[PDB]
Amino acid sequence: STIEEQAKTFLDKFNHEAEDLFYQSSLASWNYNTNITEENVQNMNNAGDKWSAFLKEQSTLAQMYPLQEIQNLTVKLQLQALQQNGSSVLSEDKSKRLNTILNTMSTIYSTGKVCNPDNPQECLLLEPGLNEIMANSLDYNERLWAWESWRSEVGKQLRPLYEEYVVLKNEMARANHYEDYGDYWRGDYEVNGVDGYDYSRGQLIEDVEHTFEEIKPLYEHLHAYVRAKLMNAYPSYISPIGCLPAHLLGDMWGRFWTNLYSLTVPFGQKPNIDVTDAMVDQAWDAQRIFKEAEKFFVSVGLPNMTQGFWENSMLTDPGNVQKAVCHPTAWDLGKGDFRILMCTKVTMDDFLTAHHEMGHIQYDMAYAAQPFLLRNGANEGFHEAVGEIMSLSAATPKHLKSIGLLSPDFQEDNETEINFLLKQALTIVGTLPFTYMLEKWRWMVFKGEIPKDQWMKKWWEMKREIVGVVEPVPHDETYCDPASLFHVSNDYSFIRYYTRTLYQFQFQEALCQAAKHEGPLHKCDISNSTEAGQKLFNMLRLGKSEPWTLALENVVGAKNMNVRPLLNYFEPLFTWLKDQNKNSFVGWSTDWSPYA
Amino acid sequence: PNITNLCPFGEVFNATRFASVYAWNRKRISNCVADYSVLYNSASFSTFKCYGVSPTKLNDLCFTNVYADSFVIRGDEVRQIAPGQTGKIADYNYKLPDDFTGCVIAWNSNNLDSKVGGNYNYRYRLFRKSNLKPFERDISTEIYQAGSKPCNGVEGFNCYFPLQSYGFQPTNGVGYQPYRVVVLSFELLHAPATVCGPKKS
Ligand SMILES: *[C@@H]1O[C@H](CO)[C@@H](O[C@@H]2O[C@H](CO)[C@@H](O[C@@H]3O[C@H](CO)[C@@H](O)[C@H](O)[C@@H]3O)[C@H](O)[C@H]2NC(C)=O)[C@H](O)[C@H]1NC(C)=O
Ligand SMILES: *[C@@H]1O[C@H](CO)[C@@H](O[C@@H]2O[C@H](CO)[C@@H](O)[C@H](O)[C@H]2NC(C)=O)[C@H](O)[C@H]1NC(C)=O
Ligand SMILES: *[C@@H]1O[C@H](CO)[C@@H](O[C@@H]2O[C@H](CO)[C@@H](O)[C@H](O)[C@H]2NC(C)=O)[C@H](O)[C@H]1NC(C)=O
Ligand SMILES: *[C@@H]1O[C@H](CO)[C@@H](O[C@@H]2O[C@H](CO)[C@@H](O)[C@H](O)[C@H]2NC(C)=O)[C@H](O)[C@H]1NC(C)=O
Ligand SMILES: *[C@@H]1O[C@H](CO)[C@@H](O)[C@H](O)[C@H]1NC(C)=O
Ligand SMILES: *[C@@H]1O[C@H](CO)[C@@H](O)[C@H](O)[C@H]1NC(C)=O
Ligand SMILES: *[C@@H]1O[C@H](CO)[C@@H](O)[C@H](O)[C@H]1NC(C)=O
């Protein structure tokens, strides 16, 4: 009996006793989250570390098996997850310092405060307030003041902390057989198994900007239109040649352009689509919303949800002193237990969020039969794309009229369709260059291509051609602008959001093609189509058992990640913009600056 | 005939405590009139599968003895109790022959066995050297060995305890709820038949 049988026996022993401990930890976490109290705090810890206290030893024991002779692909893939040294490879005296620096960085970011100099005894936080000022206000001076103050009292002390963080994490990267931390992050998009489906870590670099170049023509027209509208709004502050500044976007970092929809509405004579008052008139409660969100999935073909989800899940309104943090979440506690958590209200936004979380729950339920270590999506981008597909497909006017919310005698026309398309474009396609630029800069800074001095200038020069944003007021070397972001100071990878959009659009296009629909893609629907449900389930049930390249072979017909469905979705908007800005010129000048 | 000496099915289906699957209880029933209609005409049983004979015809013919094997398993493992099946239970705990004749009854007992903190009384075998023969019970607790070096007792690298417990909880979904299982087997040796239903009149 070779080591291949020993590996099977060890895994069979491991997962059985891991399931119960993971279930207990999840139960403790849910108990705390639903019921915030001190009595329910320590319990979480008393479970949490213990779970980790069990995961380390099994990680230590998964080294006497030389994972180069195991021939079964499933067993080798399952064993590869356990053989992760993690931060244990570093020396203890450095690991403690790394933990301390992460903790202090997180606390510093979470404890930001800015006082107006006229009133130095009242500082505002990143909570509603300063963020509300930056998002919903019409004033150049105060926007510039808030931007500069936040980047000057949070972005100054983080420079040495980040400088030490980079080198320490990079030393860990060499400790884990990687020449950079960027490779450690990109390792998830890597497979070396089935022939013909191999994908290397380095291929993603050449694959990202290869598919980014096709989006530039679509982004340039949006940039020109937004710049023209801002010029018509802000007099003598934005040149028609140069590109718009950073603090006029509507967000502190400019991640999303949704807040700018009010200024750049194409033609707002006709009203927007809203059914919230109709929901209130028909007396819709949480149960009705969550049952209409289930009949859709039943009609598609996916299995009905289990009993007990209606009993244990905290669906709506904790109410009294029994408080709860209710950021909308879908919980998979294991052992066949699924729950949801939300403070639902009677609003269309809550309807779409319920559809999103319902899709999350369905995807979680799909792969419950796989072993413990394979109960995840193929990559980090599939889960959110699957969640957002339902939200995209459950907002069309046809589906709304089917459930009898919109009037049966409703006629759509040019302007409402164009307005909705532009509203969605301001959020979906307006954030890709920002994510691409941020991830590129982080990859280069980890690779060491740009030295220490070339940090604050390389960022801002690159932002000009990639994004089209100028300096409001210059920063030389004493600031850390990217540090003032949640996904940069808390050690979170940022490439997920770039691939999520393309994956979701490819999935939607493939389903609509295999759903017998005629017309533009944005009006399509996947209701009452069982074959589409079967096609989706054939990929959902796989879990992490197969390479994601093979997963992108049952829904769509091509394993590579392309951008053609994205351009096909925004075709009417693009063809309207082609004749819209017939007098202005697309593209920006990188030399013009507000200060010089 | 006045129909007396009823077989005591109440002591089997309504027992206070059941045994673990690796130590299933065997009870011998003989020399009594048995009424299977009261069992078949009950809506409290989730699974009732008869292989050798049809349930309705069972009230006519009769055998020389009956054997009742009772235990408790998981919800998803009921399908493993059948002729020509494979799995952990069907290999290391309880095996039925291909020519099996009799019936299998299984019903949910979540409201009794499950406990808020977790019920860990029920156990089952996880490793064994070889597959079991039909109707063979193994209760030995020898320490298993999977590698090459022999281990003197205490668990080592490749030396695992063969028995593992169950983790029943009140909220587990029908996949993991406990289920109580009773298997009835009819045996027809050369001795004269004694166990069959009432002479209706
Ligand atoms: C194990 O115990 C249960 C609980 O007592 C037994 O089920 C119950 O059995 C009794 C009689 O055996 C049933 O009573 C019925 O009452 C109606 C009138 O309500 C009468 O018309 C019937 O002739 C019968 O006497 C009862 O419905 C039944 N179920 C419940 C929930 O009580 C069960 O029979 C016992 N197990 C065995 C193997 O006997
Ligand atoms: C790796 O091992 C697993 C488990 O032993 C194999 O999974 C089996 O796949 C066959 C394929 O038809 C099924 O019939 C079995 O039911 C599966 N389970 C078992 C326990 O046999 C898997 O095929 C193996 N991979 C290889 C050999 O490449
Ligand atoms: C994780 O850390 C262990 C502990 O050092 C590494 O195992 C050693 O690897 C080196 C070379 O790779 C060998 O010379 C030692 O004999 C190994 N020691 C033991 C106890 O196995 C391991 O390589 C690291 N990386 C993994 C597991 O991926
Ligand atoms: C899940 O949905 C299915 C399909 O609607 C349900 O099956 C039927 O549901 C209707 C109304 O919900 C009942 O009147 C029928 O008696 C059901 N038939 C069967 C064979 O079940 C199913 O009950 C639903 N399950 C849950 C837990 O809601
Ligand atoms: C919430 O926790 C407190 C602290 O023990 C407890 O008294 C209270 O009953 C709990 N409420 C619920 C609904 O569990
Ligand atoms: C819609 O567009 C077509 C083509 O330009 C035009 O003929 C028609 O009048 C438009 N309808 C409305 C309501 O704007
Ligand atoms: C027959 O059994 C019934 C049962 O109630 C009893 O009342 C009756 O006396 C019995 N008669 C004889 C002859 O055994």
CA angle at B161 for the pair B158 and B165, rounded to the nearest 5°: 135
Quick one: B95 and B158 in the same domain?
A: no
Nearest chain B residue to A10 by CA distance is B158
Q: Which residues contact A328 (CB under 8 A, 6 or more apart)?
A: A341, A342, A353, A356, A357
Can you read off the two tokens belonging to residue A587? 């593209």
Residue of B146, B160, B173 lying closest to A306 (CB–CB): B173
Residue B134: CB atoms within 10 A of its CB come to 12
Q: Do residue B17 and residue B87 come from a single domain?
A: yes
Residues of chain B found within 8 Å of residue A60, distances taken between Cβ atoms: none
User: Where do the structural domains in chain A lie, given as residue ranges?
Assistant: 1-84, 214-270+416-494+570-596, 276-412+514-564
Instruction: Give resolution in angstroms.
Output: 3.2
Give the list of residues 6+ apart from residue A307 with CB closer than 8 angstroms, or none. Answer: B174
- Cβ within 8 Å of residue A443, ≥6 positions away: A182, A205
Nearest-neighbour CA in chain B from A539: distance (Å)? 22
Q: How close A47 comes to chain B (CA, Å)?
A: 14
Write the residue in A9, A64, A336 that is nearest to B175 by C-beta: A336
Q: List own/partner pairs for A267-274 with CB under 8 A and 24 or more apart.
A: A267/A415, A267/A418, A267/A419, A268/A419, A269/A415, A270/A413, A270/A415, A270/A416, A270/A419, A272/A416, A272/A419, A272/A420, A273/A397, A273/A400, A273/A406, A273/A416, A273/A420, A274/A348
User: DSSP class of residue A450?
Assistant: S
Q: In the structure encoding, which two tokens stand for residue A454, read together?
A: 């070339």
Among A270, A412, A414, residue to substitute to test ligand 6 (most atoms within 8 Å of Cβ): A414
Q: What is the secondary structure of A224-239 as a DSSP string?
A: HHHHHHHHHHSTTSS-
> Is B147 near chain A, with CB under 8 Å?
yes
Q: Distance between terminal CA atoms of chain B?
A: 10
CA dihedral A534, A536, A539, A541 (to 10 degrees): -70
Least Cα distance to A406 among A393, A419, A396 occurs for A396
Q: Is A414 in the pocket of ligand 6 (CB under 6 A)?
A: yes
Q: Tokens for A399, please give them.
A: 């589906």
Distance CA A570, CA A522 (A): 8
- State both tokens at A366: 């799909």
B106 and B197 fall within a common domain: yes
DSSP A586: -
Q: Tell me how far apart the alpha carbons of residues A235 and A228 are, in angstroms, rounded to a whole number.
A: 11
Reply yes or no on whether A487 is catalytic. yes
Q: From CA A278, how far away is CA A368, in angstroms rounded?
A: 38
Using the structure block, give the residue that is written with the tokens 């070339």. A454
Q: Which residues pair with B105 in a beta bridge?
A: B48, B182
Q: Which residue has the tokens 């559809």?
A: A355
Q: Would you tell me how many other CB atoms lie within 10 Å of the CB of residue A102? A: 17
DSSP A542: T
Ligand 3 is surrounded, with C-beta below 6 A, by A 63, 83, 85, 89
Residue A393: name the closest of A359, A429, A342 by CA. A359
Q: What is the C-alpha to C-alpha distance for residues A126 and B99, in angstroms, rounded to an integer? A: 73
**Integer Cα distance of A285 and A351 in angstroms:** 11
Q: B182: which 2 tokens?
A: 């009773």
What's the Cα-to-Cα distance from B41 to each of A258, A310, B36, B103, rounded to whole Å? 64, 32, 8, 15
Residue A429 contacts residue A215 (beta carbons within 8 Å) = yes
**Domain membership of residue B29 as a residue range:** 1-116+170-201
Does one domain contain both B152 and B59? Answer: no
Return the ligand 6 atom nearest residue A414 CA.
1
Helix (H, G, I), strand (E, B) or coil at B165: strand
Enumerate residues 6+ apart whose C-beta is below 8 A from A215.
A429, A432, A433, A563, A566, A567
A553 in active site: no
Residue type, A142: E
Of A584, A475, A389, A441, nearest to A152 by C-alpha is A475
Phi and psi at A196, nearest 5°, equal 90, -15
CB A318 within 8 A of CB A429: no
- Phi/psi region, residue A319 (left: phi>0; alpha: psi -120 to 50; beta: rest), is left
B61 and B19 in a common domain: yes
Cα dist from A8 to A189, A452, A487, A546, A581, whole Å: 26, 49, 38, 19, 65
Q: Clarify whether residues B86 and B164 are in a common domain.
A: no
Looking at ligand 1, which atom is closest to the CA of residue B13? 38
Q: Residue A138: what are its φ and ψ, rounded to 5°?
A: -130, 85
Q: Which two tokens stand for residue B21?
A: 């699957």
State whether A312 and B169 contact (CB < 8 Å): no
Distance between Cα B131 and ligand 6 center (Å): 77
Residue pair A340/A313 in contact (Cβ under 8 Å)? The answer is yes
**Widest CA span of chain B, in angstroms?**
71
Nearest chain A residue to B163, by CA: A13
- What backbone torsions phi and psi does residue B48 show, to the nearest 5 degrees? -140, 100
Cα torsion A232, A238, A241, A247: sign? negative
Q: How many domains does chain B have?
A: 2
Q: How far is Cα A240 from Cα B190, in angstroms, rounded to an integer?
A: 106
Residues B22 and B75 both lie in one domain: yes
Q: Are both B158 and B175 inside the same structural domain? A: no
Output the 3-class SS for A50-117: HHHHHHHHHHHHCCCCCCCCCCCHHHHHHHHHHCCCHHHHCCHHHHHHHHHHHHHHHHHHHCCCEECC
Task: With residue A291 as reference, give the H or E element that holds it.
Answer: helix A286-300
**A77 φ/ψ angles, rounded to the nearest 5 degrees:** -65, -40
Q: What are phi and psi of B117, to 5 degrees?
A: -85, -10
Say which amino acid occupies A499: T
Q: How far apart are alpha carbons A356 and A310 in whole angstroms?
A: 17
3-state SS, residue A545:
helix
B52 lies in the same domain as B135: no
Q: Tell which atom from ligand 3 comes closest to the C-alpha of A85.
A: 1
Instruction: Give break positions in chain B: residue before each, C–N beyond 2.5 Å.
Output: none
Tokens representing B114 are 């499950």
Angle, helices A571-580/A216-233, rounded to nearest 10 degrees: 50
Taking the C-alpha atoms of residue B50 and residue B29, their distance in angstroms, rounded to an integer, is 18
Q: Are residues B160 and B188 in the same domain?
A: no
**How buried is A119 (Cβ within 10 angstroms: 0-12 exposed, 13-18 middle, 19+ buried)?**
exposed
The CA distance from A340 to A331, in Å, is 6
Q: How far apart are CA B22 and CA A91, in angstroms?
A: 47
Q: Which whole-number Å values give the CA distances from A311 to A13, A140, A158, A366, B171, in the listed order?
A: 33, 52, 46, 21, 10
**Does the beta-carbon distance from B126 to A16 stay under 8 Å?**
yes
Facing residue for A336 by CB, picked from B118, B127, B176: B176
Residue that has been written with the tokens 């500044």 in this structure: A245
